Structure formats: C-alpha cells, structure tokens
C-alpha cells in the first residue's frame, strides 16, 4: 500500500481545505474543535492520566470529548496518506526526559538503543487525541522526535487547521484511543532526530 505523502505547503493547504469544506461540522462540533486547539495538553493529559475513561470530568470536558468523538463521523481520509508529528523526549517514557539528547544537541546512542528496545516492532495505544501535521512543519520539525504515520483510506482523520485557533500547522486531527505500530526507528542523518516510521491501525472510539 503507498501512501499520499503531501511535498509543498500550498498543495497540503488546498488539500486540506477541500476537505474542511465538505465535513458539515455543526456549530457544537466546531465550538469543541476550537477549544481543543486551544486546550489540547489539559485534554490529551487528562484522558492519559484516566486511560480514557471520562466519567470524572467536568461536565463540560465530558460534551466537548462526545462531540470532538462525534465529529469523526463526519471526518475520514479519502486516501492513504502520511501525517507528521514532531515530539519532545518525554513522549518516549519519563526515563528519557533529560537523558535523550548529549550536550552537543546529538541523540545520545545509549537512549537511542533503549528507545529502539522499547518501541520497535510494537504497539502503542494513545488515550488523548493525536494532533498531526500534513507535511514537517517548521514549528515542531526541530524537535529531537519526528514520526510519520502511515494512515488508511477511510479512517477518521480530519483537517481542522481552518478554525484552529493558531496558524502554520496543517492541522490534520485523529481519535483519541488509536494505536499505532513502530515499523522503524532510525537516527537521522546529522545524528540530532529520532525518525519513527509508524502504521495507524484505528481508535476503538466510535460512537454511532
Ligand atoms: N506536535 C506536533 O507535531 C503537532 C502537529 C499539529 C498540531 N500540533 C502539534
């Protein structure tokens, strides 16, 4: 399978914004799609920190989760295609917080070994949703970990860039709940990034 891997901003935008166009997103929907923008770190926390489970937020965290869930109904890829995140150490696991990069600003070989053991070839279930990027942009693309998702035809995914409350990131959203497999992890070329090449499988939330 060979997946869309968009090459220039302006091609990603159109992209993108012909699909906004047509997901009919009610005022509800669009209202929690801002906010998360805004809130994504509180939500995407909270949802890690309680493995999902939703019951002992507040009542107003509980609606904008159900209509953020709600809203993939409506939102699904046309195609194949790739989405990018760029990540800090602490995605890895608390271990390699402060232990990943050298002074130099070079991956350090021993954490990269233990990120490698840890993460190749496996699984990995996340609870908050998964903000992703069209192409490697600018704002997180220097940061020590890169991952490209490979993303089936007809899975929810949904361009919410254009009522995103901040600019230049190509804002592709996924379900929370999704797990993804580590297909490689390599170094890159000047030794300063984790490359992380991953395969989407799908959330099991899905009401409706
Ligand atoms: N960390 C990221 O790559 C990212 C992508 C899109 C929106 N917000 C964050």
């Known amino acids: 399978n060979t997946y869309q891997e968009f090459t220039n901003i302006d091609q990603a935008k159109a992209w993108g914004n012909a699909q906004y166009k047509k ?11 801002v906010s998360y923008t805004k809130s994504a770190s ?4 909270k949802l890690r920190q309680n493995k999902g489970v939703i019951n002992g937020f507040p009542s107003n965290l509980i609606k904008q989760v159900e209509l953020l869930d709600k809203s993939f109904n409506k939102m699904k ?14 995605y890895l ?11 130099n600003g070079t991956i350090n070989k ?9 993460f190749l070839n496996k699984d990995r279930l996340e609870y908050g949703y998964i903000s992703t990027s069209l192409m490697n942009v600018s704002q997180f693309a220097g940061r020590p970990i890169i991952t490209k998702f490979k993303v089936a035809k007809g899975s929810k995914a ?9 600019a230049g990131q190509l804002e592709m959203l996924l379900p929370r709940h999704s797990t993804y497999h580590i297909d490689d992890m390599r170094l890159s070329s000047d030794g300063k990034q984790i490359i992380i090449t991953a395969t989407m499988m799908g959330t099991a939330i899905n009401p409706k």
Not at 23 to 33: D, V, W
Not at 77 to 90: S, V, Y
Request: proline share 5%.
């Open 23 to 33: 997901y009919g997103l009610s005022k509800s929907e669009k209202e929690a799609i």
């Open 42 to 45: 509180e939500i995407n926390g």
């Open 77 to 90: 890829t046309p195609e194949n295609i790739m989405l990018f995140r760029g990540d800090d150490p602490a």
């Open 93 to 103: 696991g608390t271990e390699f917080q402060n232990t990943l990069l050298n002074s």
């Open 110 to 118: 021993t954490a990269f070994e233990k990120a490698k053991a840890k």
């Open 158 to 166: 949904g361009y919410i860039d254009p009522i995103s409350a901040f």
